[PDB]
Design a protein around this ligand. Structure first.
Ligand SMILES: COc1ccc(CNC(=O)c2ccccc2CN(C)Cc2cccc(OC)c2C(=O)O)cc1
Ligand SMILES: COc1ccc(CNC(=O)c2ccccc2CN(C)Cc2cccc(OC)c2C(=O)O)cc1
Ligand SMILES: [Cl-]
Ligand SMILES: [Cl-]
Ligand SMILES: [Cl-]
Lengths: 150, 149
């Protein structure tokens, strides 16, 4: 059910990991900076996400997070269906690749406005979610979910 | 009213829990920090405004109202920074009640995690999903969607 479907995505910058959750139907994102991708960090990130949005399904970003018992436990706790992230639709690869490139571009555009990478990443999340393509991703997610509630 | 949020700072286990409440719905976001500083508050508001359409923030105290770093974050994120004087006296009570409820939920989950931050996010989850009938999470989405249309 597409209002509740999210995709995890892991990218790297400045020797750190940027963990991203994408709301598939809207393109809305949440993101955080962590030193390395672990099951515990991924689990915590998903717990945060599901407290904020009605997360029904998460397509994990790799096999390690799919396998992780801690991630499975977080998904159990938060009522999330944990699924693999095999791109059965080949367009998905491209969309995520394109998103990572866009995010890194925005981070470069703001990078001197903050000392810490985490701040620049949150500026990039802000800009991404507010950009009108006409609706923004932030508007699209709210509309999609509200329509589903009604 | 769809865009109005209130900051709230409470304490547990020698740490600070910073909360943003969406006033019209009761929906919350929260984080654990070692101490409330301008920089931590600024970062928290930047995160919030990237996720929801934040028009106005009523700050939790005079130090965050005064903080140039907080003012800068509000400028950056397009937020109107306001004071938190409870002109409506019922506001005090509502926030006091919310902190008590949150601490109660944290106690109910506290042994399910080592770290306080995990327990706080469990409490955020439970609070936002609780039906009182809609949940706070449903209310915020409905309020904002109605405003967009
Ligand atoms: C989000 O609120 C903002 C408030 C003001 C600005 C304007 N930019 C600068 O003044 C600046 C520019 C370059 C280097 C350092 C600075 C000053 N620092 C303190 C900004 C900063 C604040 C809060 C948390 C932070 O990281 C946790 C950081 C950081 O540096 O990453 C940006 C963001
Ligand atoms: C949200 O994902 C969950 C995964 C599993 C559970 C079930 N509870 C336990 O297994 C447990 C219970 C008590 C003490 C330690 C633990 C094990 N730890 C590792 C849980 C944990 C995971 C991720 C991040 C964490 O903090 C950053 C923590 C933490 O302890 O705070 C809850 C939540
Ligand atoms: Cl990925
Ligand atoms: Cl890694
Ligand atoms: Cl403090």
């Amino acid at each position: 059910s597409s209002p509740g479907i999210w995709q995890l995505d892991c990218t790297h910058l400045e020797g750190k990991v940027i963990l991203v959750a994408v709301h598939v139907a809207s393109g809305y994102i949440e993101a955080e900076v962590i030193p390395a991708e672990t099951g515990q960090e991924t689990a915590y990130f998903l717990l945060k996400l599901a407290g904020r949005w009605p997360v029904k399904t998460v397509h994990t970003d790799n096999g390690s997070n799919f396998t992780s018992t801690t991630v499975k436990a977080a998904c159990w706790w938060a009522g999330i269906k944990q699924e693999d992230g095999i791109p059965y639709n080949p367009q998905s690869q491209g969309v995520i690749e394109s998103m990572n490139k866009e995010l890194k571009k925005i981070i470069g555009q703001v990078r001197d406005q903050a000392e810490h990478l985490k701040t620049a990443v949150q500026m990039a999340v802000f800009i991404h979610n507010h950009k009108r393509k006409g609706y923004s991703a932030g508007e699209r997610i709210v509309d999609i979910i509200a329509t589903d509630i009604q």
